[PDB]
Design a protein around this ligand. Sequence first.
Ligand code: NA
Lengths: 275, 10, 100
Amino acid sequence: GSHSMRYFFTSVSRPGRGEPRFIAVGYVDDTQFVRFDSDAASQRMEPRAPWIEQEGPEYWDGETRKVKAHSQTHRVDLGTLRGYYNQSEAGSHTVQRMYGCDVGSDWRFLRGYHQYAYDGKDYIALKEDLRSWTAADMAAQTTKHKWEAAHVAEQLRAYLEGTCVEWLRRYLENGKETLQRTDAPKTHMTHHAVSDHEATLRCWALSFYPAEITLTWQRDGEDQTQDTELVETRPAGDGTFQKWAAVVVPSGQEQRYTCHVQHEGLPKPLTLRWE
Amino acid sequence: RTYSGPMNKV
Amino acid sequence: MIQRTPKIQVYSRHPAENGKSNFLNCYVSGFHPSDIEVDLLKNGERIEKVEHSDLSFSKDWSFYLLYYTEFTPTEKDEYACRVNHVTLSQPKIVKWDRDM
Ligand code: NA
C-alpha cells in the first residue's frame, strides 16, 4: 500500500524561563524513528526504531548538524514573527514546521509538503505543485515574497521528489520486517444495557497497524450515523493502534445492525453482528 | 532523512 | 493565538486481567499550546513512575502525547488521568473504564 515520511518540528519561546525549546520527530507511516530534544542529554538526533540503527556515524552527525541548524533558524524566526505581529517580548509563542513526502503502492512519488505555523494557526505553506506558496495573512506575504526571490520552492522540490522518496524507500527496505507489516485488527462486539428500552453495541478494533482504519455501522444494510459514537484512533504503546465505534439501538433490534471494518491488513471488508 | 537546507528565515 | 482544549482517553495497552501486568495509557490530543500537565492516579494518589511520548502534532497543528505506566490491575483499585491546560479553568479527571 501507500507510504509516507514526515518530520514535525516545534519551537516554543518562554520569556524569562530561558531561551526557546525545540523538538523534532520523524515518522515513516505511523512509526516514529528519530527524535531531537534541544534540552536533552545527548544533543544529537536519536534513534527511536531498531532499523534506523543500521545508519552509521556520518548519518547521525549529519542529521544532528541539520536539526541544530533548523532549531537556530526557528530562534531567529520567533523574534522576527514578534516584530511582524507587533507583539510584546512578554508572551510565550510557538513555531511549528512539517515537511515530508508520500509515495504510492509502487513506491513512486505521490506528493510533497512543507508547511509552517505560528501560534496554532497557518502562516505559510508550499502548494501541491511545489512551485508556489500560500500565505495565510498579510504578515506572511512578506515571507512569501522573500522565499519566492530566494527560489526556496525549487530547493524544497528537489528534496521532496528526490532525497525524501529515496530515503523513505531505503527505510522501508531496511525496516521491512516491521514497516511493511500489516496487522489486521483483532475485532469483537460488546453489548451493554442500563434500561429495558435501549442497548449500546460497541464494535472494537485492536492491535492493528498501520493506523488507518474505517469503522462504520449499518442498519438493515443502510449506513447508520445517527445515535453513533466513533472515538479517535489511539496508540496502544506497543506500535499498534485501537479504535471503537458504538451505536445505541432499541431493545430487540440488535440483529438489524452490523459493524463494518476496513483495514489494509484485511483481505476483505469484515462485517460484525451482535453475538 | 532530513532536508539539507539552507533553512531560509521567515 | 489559537487555543484548543485537550481530548483525553484513558485505557490499557492490553485487555485488563486482574493480577496480570499491563500498561495504563492516557492519550491527550487536539490541544494547543503544547504546555500540559498530566498525572496518572491510583486510588486518587499520584503514580510516581510515568513516562511519555515525544511531542508531535496533527494536520490541524494540534499536539498529542501518550503518557503511560506499567501496572497490574486488581478487583479493588481505581485508576484515572488528571489533566491541566491553559484552556481548562480547573483540572480534568477522567477515570479509567476498562471497557472504554
Ligand atoms: Na498557509
